[PDB]
Coordinates of C-alpha atoms in Angstrom, one line a residue:
Chain A
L3 CA 10.4 -26.6 28.4
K4 CA 11.3 -22.6 28.7
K5 CA 13.5 -22.5 25.6
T6 CA 11.4 -20.5 23.0
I7 CA 12.2 -17.3 21.6
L8 CA 9.5 -14.9 21.3
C9 CA 9.9 -12.3 18.6
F10 CA 7.4 -9.4 18.7
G11 CA 6.4 -6.7 16.3
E12 CA 5.9 -6.1 12.9
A13 CA 5.8 -8.7 9.9
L14 CA 5.2 -6.9 6.7
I15 CA 5.5 -7.3 2.9
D16 CA 8.7 -6.0 1.2
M17 CA 7.7 -5.0 -2.5
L18 CA 11.0 -5.0 -4.4
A19 CA 10.8 -2.9 -7.6
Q20 CA 12.5 -4.5 -10.5
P21 CA 14.4 -2.6 -13.2
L22 CA 12.4 -1.5 -16.3
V23 CA 12.9 -4.5 -18.7
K24 CA 11.5 -3.4 -22.2
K25 CA 9.9 -0.3 -23.6
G26 CA 6.7 0.6 -21.9
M27 CA 6.4 -2.8 -20.4
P28 CA 4.8 -2.4 -16.9
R29 CA 7.4 -2.3 -14.0
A30 CA 7.1 -5.5 -11.8
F31 CA 7.3 -5.5 -8.0
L32 CA 8.3 -8.8 -6.3
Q33 CA 6.6 -9.8 -2.9
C34 CA 8.8 -10.8 -0.1
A35 CA 8.0 -11.5 3.5
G36 CA 9.7 -8.9 5.9
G37 CA 9.8 -7.1 9.1
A38 CA 12.7 -6.9 11.5
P39 CA 11.4 -9.3 14.4
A40 CA 9.9 -11.3 11.7
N41 CA 13.3 -12.1 9.9
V42 CA 14.8 -13.1 13.1
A43 CA 12.0 -15.5 13.8
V44 CA 12.5 -17.2 10.5
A45 CA 16.3 -17.4 10.9
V46 CA 15.9 -18.9 14.4
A47 CA 13.3 -21.4 13.0
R48 CA 15.7 -22.3 10.0
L49 CA 18.4 -23.4 12.7
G50 CA 16.0 -25.6 14.4
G51 CA 15.3 -23.6 17.5
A52 CA 12.0 -23.2 19.0
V53 CA 10.5 -19.9 18.2
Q54 CA 7.4 -18.1 18.0
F55 CA 6.4 -14.8 16.3
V56 CA 3.9 -12.5 18.4
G57 CA 2.0 -9.9 16.5
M58 CA -0.9 -8.7 14.5
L59 CA -1.5 -9.6 10.7
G60 CA -4.0 -8.1 8.5
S61 CA -7.0 -10.2 7.3
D62 CA -5.8 -9.7 3.7
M63 CA -4.0 -11.6 0.9
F64 CA -0.7 -10.3 2.3
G65 CA -1.5 -11.3 6.1
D66 CA -2.3 -14.8 4.8
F67 CA 1.0 -14.8 2.9
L68 CA 3.0 -13.9 5.9
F69 CA 0.9 -16.5 8.1
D70 CA 1.7 -19.2 5.8
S71 CA 5.4 -18.3 5.3
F72 CA 5.8 -18.5 9.3
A73 CA 4.0 -21.9 9.3
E74 CA 6.2 -23.1 6.3
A75 CA 9.3 -21.9 8.1
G76 CA 8.5 -23.8 11.3
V77 CA 7.7 -20.6 13.3
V78 CA 5.0 -21.2 15.8
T79 CA 2.0 -19.1 15.0
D80 CA -0.3 -19.5 18.1
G81 CA 0.6 -15.9 19.3
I82 CA -0.3 -14.3 15.9
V83 CA -3.7 -12.2 16.0
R84 CA -5.5 -10.9 13.0
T85 CA -7.5 -7.8 12.3
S86 CA -9.6 -6.4 9.1
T87 CA -9.4 -2.9 10.6
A88 CA -6.1 -1.9 8.7
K89 CA -4.1 -3.6 5.9
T90 CA -0.6 -5.5 6.2
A91 CA 2.0 -2.8 6.0
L92 CA 3.9 -2.5 2.7
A93 CA 7.5 -1.5 2.2
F94 CA 8.4 -0.5 -1.4
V95 CA 12.1 -0.7 -2.1
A96 CA 13.4 0.8 -5.3
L97 CA 15.9 3.4 -6.7
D98 CA 15.6 7.2 -7.2
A99 CA 17.8 8.8 -4.8
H100 CA 19.9 9.0 -8.0
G101 CA 21.1 5.3 -7.9
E102 CA 20.5 5.1 -4.3
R103 CA 18.0 2.7 -2.7
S104 CA 14.7 4.2 -2.0
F105 CA 11.9 3.5 0.6
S106 CA 8.1 4.1 0.4
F107 CA 6.1 2.8 3.3
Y108 CA 2.3 2.3 3.6
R109 CA 2.4 2.3 7.4
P110 CA 1.4 5.5 9.4
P111 CA -1.8 3.0 9.5
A112 CA -1.2 -0.8 9.4
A113 CA -2.4 -4.0 11.0
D114 CA 1.0 -4.8 13.0
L115 CA 0.1 -1.2 14.9
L116 CA -3.0 -2.6 16.4
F117 CA -1.6 -5.3 18.6
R118 CA -2.7 -4.5 22.3
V119 CA -1.7 -5.9 25.4
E120 CA -4.9 -7.8 25.5
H121 CA -3.5 -9.8 22.6
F122 CA -0.5 -11.4 24.7
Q123 CA -1.0 -14.9 25.8
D124 CA 0.3 -16.2 29.1
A125 CA 1.6 -19.3 27.6
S126 CA 3.8 -17.5 25.2
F127 CA 5.7 -16.0 28.1
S128 CA 5.6 -19.3 30.2
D129 CA 7.5 -20.9 27.7
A130 CA 9.6 -17.9 26.6
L131 CA 13.4 -17.7 27.4
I132 CA 13.9 -14.9 25.2
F133 CA 11.7 -11.8 24.1
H134 CA 13.1 -10.0 21.1
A135 CA 11.8 -6.6 19.8
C136 CA 13.0 -3.6 17.6
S137 CA 11.9 0.0 17.5
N138 CA 9.6 -0.2 14.7
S139 CA 6.8 -1.4 17.1
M140 CA 7.3 2.0 19.1
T141 CA 6.3 4.4 16.2
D142 CA 3.2 5.6 17.9
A143 CA 2.3 5.9 21.6
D144 CA -0.1 2.9 21.9
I145 CA 2.2 0.3 20.2
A146 CA 5.1 1.5 22.1
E147 CA 3.5 1.0 25.4
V148 CA 2.4 -2.3 24.4
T149 CA 6.1 -3.2 23.5
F150 CA 7.2 -1.8 26.8
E151 CA 4.6 -4.0 28.8
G152 CA 5.9 -7.0 26.6
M153 CA 9.5 -6.5 27.8
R154 CA 8.5 -5.9 31.4
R155 CA 6.3 -9.0 31.3
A156 CA 9.1 -11.1 29.7
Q157 CA 11.5 -10.0 32.3
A158 CA 9.0 -11.0 35.0
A159 CA 8.6 -14.4 33.4
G160 CA 12.0 -15.3 33.4
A161 CA 12.9 -14.4 30.0
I162 CA 16.1 -12.5 28.5
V163 CA 14.9 -9.3 26.9
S164 CA 16.6 -8.6 23.6
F165 CA 16.4 -5.1 21.8
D166 CA 17.8 -4.4 18.3
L167 CA 17.1 -0.8 17.9
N168 CA 16.7 -1.0 14.1
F169 CA 16.0 2.7 13.9
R170 CA 14.2 3.9 10.8
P171 CA 13.2 7.6 11.1
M172 CA 11.1 7.4 8.2
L173 CA 8.6 5.5 10.1
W174 CA 8.2 8.1 12.8
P175 CA 5.6 10.9 12.9
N176 CA 6.9 14.2 11.6
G177 CA 8.3 16.7 14.2
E178 CA 8.2 14.1 16.9
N179 CA 11.3 13.2 19.0
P180 CA 11.8 9.5 19.2
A181 CA 14.6 9.7 21.7
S182 CA 12.4 9.1 24.7
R183 CA 10.9 5.9 23.6
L184 CA 14.3 4.7 22.4
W185 CA 16.0 5.1 25.7
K186 CA 13.1 3.8 27.6
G187 CA 13.2 0.5 25.3
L188 CA 17.0 0.6 26.0
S189 CA 16.4 0.6 29.8
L190 CA 14.4 -2.5 29.8
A191 CA 16.6 -4.8 27.8
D192 CA 19.3 -7.3 28.9
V193 CA 20.7 -7.5 25.4
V194 CA 21.1 -4.4 23.3
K195 CA 22.2 -4.2 19.6
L196 CA 23.0 -0.7 17.9
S197 CA 24.6 0.3 14.7
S198 CA 27.5 3.1 14.9
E199 CA 25.0 5.5 13.5
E200 CA 22.4 4.8 16.2
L201 CA 25.2 5.2 19.0
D202 CA 26.2 8.4 17.4
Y203 CA 22.5 9.6 17.4
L204 CA 22.0 8.5 21.0
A205 CA 25.3 10.5 22.0
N206 CA 23.9 13.5 20.4
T207 CA 20.6 13.3 22.5
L208 CA 22.8 13.4 25.5
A209 CA 25.2 16.1 24.1
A210 CA 28.0 13.6 24.9
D211 CA 29.9 10.8 23.4
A212 CA 29.7 7.0 22.8
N213 CA 31.1 6.3 26.3
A214 CA 28.3 8.3 28.0
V215 CA 25.7 6.1 26.0
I216 CA 27.1 3.0 27.1
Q217 CA 27.4 4.1 30.8
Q218 CA 23.7 5.0 30.5
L219 CA 22.9 1.7 29.2
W220 CA 24.5 0.1 32.5
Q221 CA 22.2 2.2 34.4
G222 CA 19.2 -0.1 33.2
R223 CA 18.9 -3.7 32.8
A224 CA 21.5 -4.1 29.9
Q225 CA 24.2 -6.5 30.3
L226 CA 25.5 -7.0 26.7
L227 CA 25.9 -4.4 24.2
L228 CA 26.7 -5.1 20.4
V229 CA 27.7 -2.2 18.2
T230 CA 27.6 -2.8 14.4
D231 CA 29.7 -1.0 11.8
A232 CA 28.7 -0.1 8.3
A233 CA 31.6 -2.0 7.4
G234 CA 31.5 -5.2 9.1
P235 CA 33.4 -5.6 12.4
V236 CA 31.0 -6.1 15.4
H237 CA 32.1 -4.7 18.7
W238 CA 30.6 -6.1 22.1
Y239 CA 30.7 -4.5 25.5
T240 CA 29.5 -6.0 28.9
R241 CA 29.7 -4.2 32.3
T242 CA 33.3 -5.6 32.7
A243 CA 35.0 -5.8 29.5
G244 CA 34.8 -5.4 25.6
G245 CA 36.0 -6.7 22.5
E246 CA 35.4 -7.8 18.9
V247 CA 33.3 -10.2 17.2
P248 CA 34.9 -12.6 14.3
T249 CA 33.8 -11.8 10.8
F250 CA 33.3 -13.9 7.8
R251 CA 33.9 -13.2 3.9
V252 CA 31.4 -14.9 1.8
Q253 CA 30.6 -12.4 -0.9
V254 CA 27.5 -10.3 -0.9
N258 CA 28.0 -6.8 5.4
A259 CA 26.6 -5.0 8.6
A260 CA 25.3 -7.5 11.1
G261 CA 21.5 -7.6 10.6
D262 CA 18.4 -9.6 11.5
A263 CA 20.0 -13.1 10.6
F264 CA 23.1 -12.3 12.9
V265 CA 20.6 -11.7 15.8
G266 CA 18.6 -14.9 14.9
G267 CA 21.9 -16.6 15.1
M268 CA 22.7 -15.1 18.6
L269 CA 19.4 -15.5 20.1
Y270 CA 19.2 -19.2 18.8
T271 CA 22.7 -20.0 20.5
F272 CA 21.5 -18.4 23.6
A273 CA 18.5 -20.7 23.9
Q274 CA 20.5 -23.7 23.2
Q275 CA 23.1 -23.0 25.7
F276 CA 21.4 -21.2 28.6
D277 CA 19.5 -23.3 31.1
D278 CA 17.9 -20.0 32.1
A279 CA 17.7 -16.3 32.0
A280 CA 20.3 -16.0 34.9
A281 CA 22.8 -17.8 32.6
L282 CA 23.3 -14.6 30.5
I283 CA 25.1 -13.1 33.5
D284 CA 27.8 -15.9 33.6
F285 CA 27.9 -15.7 29.9
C286 CA 28.6 -11.9 30.1
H287 CA 31.6 -12.7 32.5
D288 CA 33.2 -14.9 30.1
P289 CA 34.8 -13.4 27.0
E290 CA 35.7 -16.8 25.7
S291 CA 32.0 -17.8 25.5
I292 CA 31.2 -14.4 24.1
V293 CA 33.5 -14.7 21.3
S294 CA 32.6 -18.3 20.5
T295 CA 28.9 -17.5 20.4
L296 CA 29.2 -14.3 18.4
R297 CA 31.3 -15.9 15.8
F298 CA 28.3 -18.3 15.1
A299 CA 26.1 -15.2 14.8
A300 CA 28.4 -13.7 12.3
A301 CA 28.6 -16.8 10.3
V302 CA 24.7 -17.0 10.1
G303 CA 24.7 -13.5 9.1
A304 CA 27.4 -14.0 6.4
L305 CA 25.5 -17.0 4.9
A306 CA 22.0 -15.3 4.9
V307 CA 20.9 -14.2 1.3
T308 CA 19.4 -10.8 0.6
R309 CA 17.8 -9.0 -2.3
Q310 CA 17.6 -5.2 -2.2
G311 CA 17.4 -5.9 1.6
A312 CA 14.8 -8.5 2.6
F313 CA 15.9 -12.1 3.1
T314 CA 15.5 -14.7 0.5
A315 CA 17.3 -17.6 2.4
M316 CA 18.3 -18.4 5.7
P317 CA 21.1 -20.9 6.6
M318 CA 20.5 -24.2 8.2
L319 CA 22.5 -25.2 11.3
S320 CA 24.8 -27.7 9.3
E321 CA 25.7 -24.9 6.7
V322 CA 26.6 -22.4 9.5
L323 CA 28.6 -25.0 11.2
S324 CA 30.4 -26.1 8.0
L325 CA 31.4 -22.5 7.3
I326 CA 32.8 -22.1 10.8
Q327 CA 34.7 -25.4 10.6
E328 CA 36.1 -24.5 7.1
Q329 CA 37.0 -20.7 7.7
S330 CA 39.1 -22.4 10.4
Chain B
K4 CA -15.5 26.2 -23.9
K5 CA -13.8 23.0 -25.3
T6 CA -11.9 21.0 -22.5
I7 CA -13.3 17.9 -20.7
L8 CA -12.4 18.2 -17.1
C9 CA -12.1 14.7 -15.5
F10 CA -12.0 14.9 -11.6
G11 CA -11.1 12.5 -8.9
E12 CA -9.0 9.7 -8.2
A13 CA -5.9 8.4 -10.1
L14 CA -4.2 5.5 -8.4
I15 CA -2.0 2.5 -9.1
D16 CA -3.6 -0.7 -10.1
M17 CA -1.0 -3.7 -8.9
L18 CA -1.9 -6.7 -10.9
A19 CA -0.9 -10.2 -9.3
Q20 CA 1.0 -12.3 -11.7
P21 CA 0.7 -16.1 -11.9
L22 CA 3.5 -17.9 -9.9
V23 CA 6.2 -18.8 -12.5
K24 CA 8.6 -20.9 -10.4
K25 CA 7.8 -22.3 -6.9
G26 CA 10.7 -20.8 -5.0
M27 CA 10.4 -17.5 -6.8
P28 CA 8.8 -14.2 -5.3
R29 CA 5.2 -13.6 -6.6
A30 CA 5.3 -10.6 -8.9
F31 CA 2.9 -7.5 -9.3
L32 CA 2.7 -5.3 -12.3
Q33 CA 2.3 -1.7 -12.0
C34 CA -0.6 0.1 -14.2
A35 CA -2.1 3.3 -14.0
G36 CA -5.5 3.3 -12.8
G37 CA -8.5 5.3 -11.1
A38 CA -12.0 5.6 -12.9
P39 CA -11.9 9.3 -14.2
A40 CA -8.2 8.9 -14.5
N41 CA -8.5 6.2 -17.0
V42 CA -11.1 8.3 -18.8
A43 CA -9.0 11.3 -19.1
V44 CA -6.2 9.1 -20.6
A45 CA -8.6 7.6 -23.3
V46 CA -9.9 11.0 -24.3
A47 CA -6.4 12.3 -24.7
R48 CA -5.4 9.4 -27.0
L49 CA -8.3 10.0 -28.9
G50 CA -7.2 13.5 -29.5
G51 CA -9.7 15.4 -27.3
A52 CA -8.5 18.2 -25.1
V53 CA -8.8 17.1 -21.6
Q54 CA -7.5 17.9 -18.1
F55 CA -7.2 15.7 -15.1
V56 CA -7.9 17.5 -11.9
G57 CA -7.3 15.5 -8.5
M58 CA -4.6 15.1 -6.0
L59 CA -1.5 12.8 -6.5
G60 CA 1.0 11.8 -3.9
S61 CA 4.5 13.2 -3.9
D62 CA 5.7 9.5 -4.0
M63 CA 7.1 7.4 -6.7
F64 CA 3.6 6.3 -7.6
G65 CA 2.4 9.8 -8.0
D66 CA 5.3 10.6 -10.1
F67 CA 4.4 7.7 -12.3
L68 CA 0.7 8.7 -12.5
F69 CA 1.7 12.4 -13.4
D70 CA 4.0 11.3 -16.3
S71 CA 1.4 8.9 -17.4
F72 CA -1.0 11.8 -17.7
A73 CA 1.6 13.9 -19.6
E74 CA 2.7 11.3 -22.0
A75 CA -0.9 10.6 -23.0
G76 CA -1.5 14.3 -23.8
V77 CA -3.6 14.9 -20.6
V78 CA -3.2 18.6 -19.4
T79 CA -1.6 18.5 -15.8
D80 CA -1.7 21.9 -14.4
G81 CA -4.9 21.3 -12.5
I82 CA -3.0 18.5 -10.4
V83 CA -2.0 19.2 -7.0
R84 CA 0.2 17.0 -4.7
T85 CA 0.6 16.2 -1.1
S86 CA 3.1 14.5 1.0
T87 CA 0.4 13.8 3.8
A88 CA -0.8 10.4 2.3
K89 CA 0.4 7.9 -0.1
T90 CA -0.8 7.4 -3.7
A91 CA -3.6 4.8 -3.3
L92 CA -3.1 1.2 -4.3
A93 CA -5.6 -1.4 -5.8
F94 CA -4.2 -4.8 -5.5
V95 CA -6.2 -7.3 -7.9
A96 CA -4.9 -10.8 -7.3
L97 CA -6.6 -14.3 -8.3
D98 CA -7.5 -15.1 -4.6
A99 CA -9.2 -18.0 -3.7
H100 CA -10.9 -20.7 -5.8
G101 CA -10.3 -18.8 -9.1
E102 CA -12.2 -15.8 -8.0
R103 CA -10.2 -12.4 -8.5
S104 CA -9.9 -10.6 -5.2
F105 CA -9.0 -7.0 -4.3
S106 CA -7.2 -5.1 -1.4
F107 CA -7.4 -1.6 -1.6
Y108 CA -4.9 0.8 0.3
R109 CA -7.6 3.5 0.5
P110 CA -8.4 5.3 2.9
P111 CA -6.1 6.9 3.6
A112 CA -5.0 8.2 0.2
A113 CA -3.7 11.4 -1.4
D114 CA -6.5 11.6 -3.8
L115 CA -8.9 11.8 -0.9
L116 CA -7.3 14.9 0.2
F117 CA -8.1 17.4 -2.7
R118 CA -9.9 20.3 -1.3
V119 CA -12.1 23.0 -2.7
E120 CA -9.5 25.5 -2.7
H121 CA -7.3 23.5 -5.1
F122 CA -9.9 24.1 -8.0
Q123 CA -8.8 26.8 -10.3
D124 CA -11.5 29.0 -11.9
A125 CA -9.4 28.7 -15.2
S126 CA -10.2 25.1 -15.4
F127 CA -14.0 25.6 -15.1
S128 CA -14.4 28.6 -17.6
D129 CA -12.6 26.5 -20.2
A130 CA -14.6 23.3 -19.5
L131 CA -17.3 22.1 -21.9
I132 CA -17.7 18.9 -19.6
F133 CA -17.0 18.1 -16.0
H134 CA -16.9 14.3 -15.4
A135 CA -16.9 12.6 -12.2
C136 CA -17.5 9.2 -10.6
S137 CA -18.6 8.0 -7.1
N138 CA -15.1 7.0 -6.0
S139 CA -14.4 10.5 -5.1
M140 CA -17.5 10.3 -2.6
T141 CA -16.1 7.6 -0.5
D142 CA -15.8 9.9 2.8
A143 CA -17.7 13.0 3.6
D144 CA -15.2 15.6 2.8
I145 CA -14.2 14.3 -0.7
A146 CA -17.8 13.9 -1.5
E147 CA -18.6 17.6 -0.8
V148 CA -15.7 18.6 -2.8
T149 CA -17.0 16.6 -5.7
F150 CA -20.5 18.1 -5.3
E151 CA -19.0 21.5 -5.0
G152 CA -17.0 20.9 -8.2
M153 CA -20.2 19.7 -10.1
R154 CA -22.1 22.8 -9.0
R155 CA -19.3 25.1 -10.1
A156 CA -19.1 23.4 -13.5
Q157 CA -22.8 23.8 -13.9
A158 CA -22.7 27.5 -13.0
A159 CA -19.9 28.0 -15.5
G160 CA -21.9 26.5 -18.3
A161 CA -20.2 23.1 -18.4
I162 CA -22.1 19.8 -19.0
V163 CA -21.9 17.6 -15.9
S164 CA -21.3 14.1 -16.5
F165 CA -21.7 11.4 -13.7
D166 CA -20.5 7.9 -14.4
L167 CA -21.5 6.2 -11.2
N168 CA -19.0 3.5 -11.3
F169 CA -20.0 2.2 -7.9
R170 CA -17.6 0.2 -6.0
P171 CA -19.0 -0.9 -2.6
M172 CA -15.7 -2.2 -1.2
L173 CA -14.1 1.2 -1.4
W174 CA -17.0 2.6 0.9
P175 CA -16.6 2.7 4.8
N176 CA -17.9 -0.4 6.6
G177 CA -21.6 -0.1 8.0
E178 CA -22.3 3.1 5.9
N179 CA -25.2 3.4 3.3
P180 CA -23.8 5.1 0.2
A181 CA -27.5 5.8 -1.2
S182 CA -27.6 9.2 0.1
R183 CA -24.5 10.6 -1.5
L184 CA -25.1 8.6 -4.8
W185 CA -28.4 10.3 -5.2
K186 CA -27.1 13.6 -4.5
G187 CA -24.4 13.2 -7.1
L188 CA -27.1 11.8 -9.4
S189 CA -29.1 14.9 -9.0
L190 CA -26.5 17.3 -10.0
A191 CA -25.5 15.6 -13.3
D192 CA -26.9 16.4 -16.6
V193 CA -25.4 13.3 -18.2
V194 CA -25.8 9.9 -16.2
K195 CA -24.2 6.7 -17.0
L196 CA -25.1 3.5 -15.1
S197 CA -24.7 -0.2 -15.3
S198 CA -27.6 -2.4 -15.4
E199 CA -26.5 -3.6 -12.0
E200 CA -26.3 -0.4 -10.6
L201 CA -29.8 0.5 -11.8
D202 CA -31.2 -2.4 -10.0
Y203 CA -29.1 -1.3 -6.9
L204 CA -30.7 2.3 -7.0
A205 CA -34.2 0.7 -7.8
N206 CA -33.8 -1.1 -4.4
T207 CA -32.8 1.9 -2.6
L208 CA -36.3 3.2 -3.6
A209 CA -38.0 -0.1 -2.9
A210 CA -39.4 0.3 -6.4
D211 CA -38.5 -0.6 -10.0
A212 CA -36.1 1.0 -12.9
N213 CA -38.8 3.4 -13.8
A214 CA -38.9 5.0 -10.4
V215 CA -35.2 5.5 -10.7
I216 CA -35.4 7.1 -14.0
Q217 CA -38.1 9.4 -13.0
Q218 CA -36.3 10.3 -9.8
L219 CA -33.2 11.3 -11.9
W220 CA -35.6 13.7 -14.0
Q221 CA -36.2 15.5 -10.6
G222 CA -32.8 16.9 -10.7
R223 CA -30.4 18.0 -13.4
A224 CA -30.3 14.9 -15.5
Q225 CA -31.3 15.1 -19.3
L226 CA -29.9 12.0 -20.5
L227 CA -29.2 8.4 -18.9
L228 CA -27.2 5.5 -20.4
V229 CA -27.5 2.3 -19.0
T230 CA -24.9 -0.3 -20.2
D231 CA -25.3 -4.2 -20.1
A232 CA -22.4 -6.7 -19.4
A233 CA -23.9 -8.4 -22.7
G234 CA -26.2 -6.4 -24.4
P235 CA -26.9 -3.0 -26.2
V236 CA -26.8 0.3 -24.6
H237 CA -30.0 1.8 -23.6
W238 CA -30.6 5.5 -23.5
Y239 CA -33.3 7.6 -21.7
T240 CA -34.3 11.2 -22.0
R241 CA -37.1 13.1 -20.3
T242 CA -39.3 12.6 -23.5
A243 CA -38.1 9.2 -24.8
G244 CA -36.0 6.0 -24.6
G245 CA -34.5 3.3 -27.0
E246 CA -31.3 1.4 -27.5
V247 CA -28.1 1.9 -29.2
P248 CA -27.2 -0.8 -32.0
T249 CA -23.6 -1.5 -31.7
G261 CA -17.5 -0.2 -20.3
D262 CA -14.9 2.7 -19.7
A263 CA -13.8 2.8 -23.2
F264 CA -17.4 3.6 -24.1
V265 CA -17.3 6.6 -21.6
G266 CA -14.0 7.7 -23.2
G267 CA -15.7 7.6 -26.8
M268 CA -18.8 9.4 -25.6
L269 CA -17.0 12.3 -23.9
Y270 CA -14.6 12.7 -26.8
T271 CA -17.4 12.7 -29.3
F272 CA -19.6 15.0 -27.2
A273 CA -16.8 17.5 -27.0
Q274 CA -16.4 17.4 -30.9
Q275 CA -20.2 17.7 -31.5
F276 CA -21.5 20.3 -28.9
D277 CA -20.5 23.9 -29.2
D278 CA -22.0 24.6 -25.8
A279 CA -24.0 23.0 -22.8
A280 CA -27.4 24.1 -24.5
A281 CA -26.3 21.6 -27.4
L282 CA -27.1 18.8 -25.1
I283 CA -30.8 19.8 -24.8
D284 CA -31.2 19.8 -28.7
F285 CA -29.3 16.4 -28.8
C286 CA -31.7 14.9 -26.2
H287 CA -34.7 15.9 -28.4
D288 CA -33.1 14.1 -31.4
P289 CA -33.3 10.3 -31.3
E290 CA -31.7 9.8 -34.5
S291 CA -28.5 12.0 -33.5
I292 CA -28.5 10.1 -30.2
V293 CA -28.4 6.6 -31.9
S294 CA -25.8 7.9 -34.5
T295 CA -23.8 9.5 -32.0
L296 CA -23.6 6.8 -29.2
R297 CA -23.1 4.1 -31.9
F298 CA -20.1 6.0 -33.2
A299 CA -18.9 6.7 -29.6
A300 CA -18.8 2.9 -28.7
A301 CA -16.8 2.2 -32.0
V302 CA -14.1 5.2 -31.9
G303 CA -13.8 4.3 -28.2
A304 CA -11.9 1.2 -29.1
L305 CA -9.1 3.2 -30.5
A306 CA -8.3 4.9 -27.2
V307 CA -6.9 1.4 -26.5
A312 CA 0.4 -0.7 -36.4
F313 CA -2.9 -2.1 -35.8
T314 CA -6.2 -3.3 -37.8
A315 CA -9.0 -0.8 -37.9
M316 CA -11.3 -3.6 -39.4
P317 CA -14.1 -4.3 -39.6
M318 CA -15.0 -1.2 -37.8
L319 CA -13.4 1.2 -40.2
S320 CA -15.5 -0.2 -43.2
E321 CA -18.5 -0.5 -40.9
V322 CA -18.4 3.4 -40.0
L323 CA -17.5 4.3 -43.6
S324 CA -20.2 2.3 -45.4
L325 CA -22.7 3.9 -42.9
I326 CA -21.7 7.5 -43.8
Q327 CA -21.7 6.8 -47.5
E328 CA -25.2 5.3 -47.6
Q329 CA -26.3 8.2 -45.5
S330 CA -24.8 10.7 -47.8
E331 CA -26.2 8.7 -50.9

């Protein structure tokens, strides 16, 4: 069976700063499993899809926590490698930008950044129908090349390559221009997901507009593009048309990792092989149907200061779609 | 003059909390930490004039440490900041079979980037005591910075205090700390060791405790204090030794008391030649150190008071 969704990249700890409780009581931080591709993997596993997380975890308490969290969720762990050379990355989340949500990362150096091409396993790509990655595994030259090689290997092995930009400027070296790597990753993906802001960023790097960006994507492997709005309406584009994705109102909005997990999960269930993506992209009726499912997953996922605390099961997602209909 | 200059690392201790409810995320409590940093705070709480010299990150944790120093009464103008690295983190959780584990996010770290040019002459000319620990010797650069600070202090007339506080886990894999430890020990006037560290040092010499003590007398050391997990504190000088009839609290009480008793660095020598004073001062140091922690002062209050009365009578 070649139905496994391979999520590659970083898995890290989101440390959620809690509000001050009493007097000089020490502030508390809550430990939550995180990482863009990691969240996608857990969302897929919760729905019942075959999924594996490929990446490097530290040989520390946090790495053990992430490993066990993956196992408990049903995510295959065979492709995970370990290292004592660096610690598991930490992402501290709090408030200080006045009342804004602040971020403090312990990642210029981290375990996930040390994954090398030699760590990939042929069995992973043999059984993979989808390879999903994000730009965080492109923050330095070495890890970026590993991500590109994974995308190239996936394509050659018959897997659909999914790329959710998930651009986080803070994680990139000061003074360096990430444009080059982002465009390269974009040229190697069959399915691309961008936020409105990232689309604007990319347009600026071209000294042009959104249309120019989309046309640039069509010059590569891209067959499907999703653009998320801060608000909530997701737009989709293929080389033959464009439209909107049905949304859901379930009280908390922009499509994130759960949405992606929902989408890839459906792809793996419905596609016999990678070539099936082409027919899918030529059929707006299927596109709308599948993205509605993805939106339902995103709407049901529960987050706390970012970081997912609960992913929905298939029955719950289908019930929402059935009800809100 | 009068100020106690504590130099080195200030970091965040993240204490893992026992799981309250299965489905809830494990919690970690933030606490100001760092060896010389904690001593600086204790001295300040006791009422001594103290300044912490070191580098703090420009992050949320650095601001927390800076504020903690300020609130305790520690002088902060000797503190420098950097965005180049994050404030170090020290995770202590009860990992595996009831044993308390550790996970340090150091190196890299902001405190490791303090450079010689960050020292201010004003800090040294006003210092009666310069106190350091081995944590600021974990890499070649910060170690040299620490040694130069100790030399500057000595040259400026400050008593140099060195609390080994050896933590192997913080040192580079495959390296032997012995060399740096001995160099630091050779530059201190006052040395504080745990019984364990004494044995460790003895081994580096392939000898006994006496060999370590004699080696110490080869450098600047005039007073050695050796603490026990469970037992009296042993003191040693170049002419004698004995025990104090009674950890970091102790070091705080000691520095605080030394600063209250000694007019200058030369006063340490007279002190070392006066066992009665050594005994009285260290016992008091241990006792008053408990205050750097409405509360009861008993039985310590009466114990201290009865002794002074008897001595005066």
